[PDB]
Amino acid sequence: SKECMTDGTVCYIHNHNDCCGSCLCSNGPIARPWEMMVGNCMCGPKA
Numbered sequence: 001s002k003e004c005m006t007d008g009t010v011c012y013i014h015n016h017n018d019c020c021g022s023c024l025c026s027n028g029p030i031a032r033p034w035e036m037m038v039g040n041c042m043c044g045p046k047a
Contacts, residue, residue, distance in 0.1 A: 007044045019043040 004020035011017040025041040033039070 005043055007042065009043050010040060011043050013041075022046045 002020075004018055005011070006019075007021050009019070011019050011023050013023065021043045022045075023041045024044040026038055028038045030038050
């Protein structure tokens with residue numbers, strides 16, 4: 001048996017978080033990090 005999470009749920013490589021999918025970090029443009037910080041990684045489907 002195995003218990004993991006799906007894409008869309010925040011994950012941390014240094015948080016012993018095990019996600020069935022691979023974490024994808026977005027390097028999008030950062031114009032307003034005060035309200036929208038584009039520097040987080042979440043779980044996603046493997047290609």
